[PDB]
Amino acid sequence: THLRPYETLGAHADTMDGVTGTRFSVWAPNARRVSVVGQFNYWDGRRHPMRLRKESGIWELFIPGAHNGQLYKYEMIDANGNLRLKSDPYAFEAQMRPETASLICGLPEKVVQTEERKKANQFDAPISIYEVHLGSWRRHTDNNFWLSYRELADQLVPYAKWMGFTHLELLPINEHPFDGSWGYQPTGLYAPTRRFGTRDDFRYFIDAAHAAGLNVILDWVPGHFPTDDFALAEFDGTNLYEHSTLIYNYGRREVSNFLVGNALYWIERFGIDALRVDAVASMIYGGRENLEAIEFLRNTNRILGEQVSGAVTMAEESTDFPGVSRPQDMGGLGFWYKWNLGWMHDTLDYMKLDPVYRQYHHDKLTFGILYNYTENFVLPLSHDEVVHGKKSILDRMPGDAWQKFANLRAYYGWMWAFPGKKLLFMGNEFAQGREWNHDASLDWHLLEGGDNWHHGVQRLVRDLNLTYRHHKAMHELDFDPYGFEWLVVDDKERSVLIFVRRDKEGNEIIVASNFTPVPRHDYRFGINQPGKWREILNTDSMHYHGSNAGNGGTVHSDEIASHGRQHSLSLTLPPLATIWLVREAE
Ligand SMILES: OC[C@H]1O[C@@H](O)[C@H](O)[C@@H](O)[C@@H]1O
């Protein structure tokens, strides 16, 4: 009604007086007269004229014979007296490249969210996200054509599922005219792009993802106004959706309706489990504060939480605007999760340095625990990091080849144990050497031939995901100080960092990282829980083409004081590696 305007505006199928047809509604308070033109009219605007309404400003009409499948637009007389063809803002399907225009299809049946999908979005869940641009994941060999939604449901769902990810994150699949925007310069907010098939196909892709046990996070764009093809600027002749560089007018009721309404659309009518909002800073800009942007995010989040609890939202915000992932009543904004850009910048800068200069930059691996409780973090290695001459993640690493791969493997070992949910952009899991190209398939060829270093990283990421999801200690208490404790925080001259993760029932898994090529034998450190400890993950294993250094079985604790603790372990730490230890019941 007042929240889901997509249910009454646009083109919908109805039958009045007995006979069937479709009814068209468009919001335009100004503008002299408005008509519907399509395949049922010879595109003649003199035929079917619409009637405007007073206390809404909506032109409407019920055209008999006009059915699902035909194309249509609106021929209007702009409030300044101009003749302009407009596509429906609430178009559910469209046609890209060789034109622009709306379709008649109506709304899809609608999806009631199951309980396993709500459980998976929670703060106590393991959450590991595979971020993908549908247009450049893979391509057909012969001709370089895109995979359709249905082919992605048969190839991209099983892959993300086998690799052990819990979530799939899509770069924007709303209709957009150019591939170079990656989806962030949209023209139709309610239509899945037609690049990969119909909107029912997309719906089928989401069903398949649910059926495989994945949740789906969709990149959502309320921060970028349609500045293309004349799709939403000067709509009726006045600044309908825009202000008075082209930004939204979040102040108006109906505009806020068009945006909020779009959010319930994806979650209820496509079964989307979460929404991510980018450039939140670009939206809410202390002194520039756009009061109406801050309030729009707060109302969206509040309404979502009330109308579809179980679904959550995530945000990227680059100015440390306090309280991004906190309840509205204080700081506010009201997002469930926040991208940890600081950690991504810190660990990468650290990771980049010659292993030999790391002793002077230790503070880049520790500093992130100081503020881990001010926001609910996702640790993101996303698309922004591998474009525009920023190099891939693997090209950031130092040394000859084997060293770059050992470094990258150790980093993932660190990343997957650090408080925060995980996000990995496609191509990173097999260590692509080249930067991402939206125009081409990923470098899947690196994985051709006999077992190689890239298979090694790919196997690691899978074990990393599987292990991480098995042990509560690794995910239960990310956002509670009890969940993480330092064991060795100040071994700067050797670059060794050891800490513990802790589940609700007190169980500890020990994480040790060696960030230099020098292997450490008989490395002694204090523990809280004496007994028998055993490796469960070792990034230097030869299964990932490491050198296979390690502890080769159970190691018992010694009652020998160390680092202020009554008991200790003496271990091998493999070079440029991280390991995880679990305690054996006795
Ligand atoms: O089109 C398919 C092929 O395209 C190339 O650009 C990629 O590097 C290959 O890995 C891929 O398999």
Curated annotation (Swiss-Prot):
It catalyses: Transfers a segment of a (1->4)-alpha-D-glucan chain to a primary hydroxy group in a similar glucan chain. The keyword Membrane does not apply. The keyword Ribonucleoprotein does not apply. GO terms for molecular function: 1,4-alpha-glucan branching enzyme activity; cation binding; hydrolase activity, hydrolyzing O-glycosyl compounds. GO terms for biological process: DNA damage response; glycogen biosynthetic process. Coiled coil: none annotated. It comes from the Bacteria. Its EC number is 2.4.1.18. The active site is at 278 (nucleophile), 316 (proton donor). Pathway: Glycan biosynthesis; glycogen biosynthesis. It is an enzyme of class 2 (transferase). Keywords: Carbohydrate metabolism, Glycogen biosynthesis, Glycogen metabolism, Glycosyltransferase, Transferase. GO terms for cellular component: cytoplasm; cytosol. Monomer. Belongs to the glycosyl hydrolase 13 family. GlgB subfamily. Catalyzes the formation of the alpha-1,6-glucosidic linkages in glycogen by scission of a 1,4-alpha-linked oligosaccharide from growing alpha-1,4-glucan chains and the subsequent attachment of the oligosaccharide to the alpha-1,6 position. This is 1,4-alpha-glucan branching enzyme GlgB. It comes from Escherichia coli (strain K12). The gene is glgB.
